[PDB]
């Protein structure tokens, strides 16, 4: 009977951990999401700049 209640809380001990782990995946949701979109809009404003730079090249080179 001892080994029984012994294993009980031990399992629950891991359950309490998953809790924190779940709170960790939520953080990885906020970051990736917003960031992935920002860095994605980066190539947009970066590409355009590379374009205008091409003009500065054909007039100053």
């Amino acid at each position: 009977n001892r080994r029984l209640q012994q294993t009980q809380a031990q399992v629950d001990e891991v359950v309490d951990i998953m809790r924190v782990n779940v709170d960790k995946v939520l953080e990885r949701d906020q970051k990736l999401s917003e960031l992935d979109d920002r860095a994605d809009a980066l190539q947009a404003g970066a590409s355009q700049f590379e374009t205008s730079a091409a003009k500065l090249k054909r007039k100053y080179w």
Binding site: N1, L4, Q5, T7, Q8, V11, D12, V14, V15, M18, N21, V22, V25, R28, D29, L32, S33, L35, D36, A39, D40, L42, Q43, A46, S47, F49, E50, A53, A54, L56, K57, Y60, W61
Partner: protein, 66 residues
Amino acid sequence: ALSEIETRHSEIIKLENSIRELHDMFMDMAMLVESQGEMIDRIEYNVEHAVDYVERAVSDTKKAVK
């Protein structure tokens, strides 16, 4: 004693399923680790590429003055 084998039962069933709930988390979590593992596939993609566009930007600008 019946009071033991019985208490054991209700306790074991309250031990396995206690893992069930935990098992459910490993399920959702794993499904999320792979889910969010997609964004990273784009992050790595964008990042390096963003450096390619910027690298071409810093080059032309420098040669636009020389």
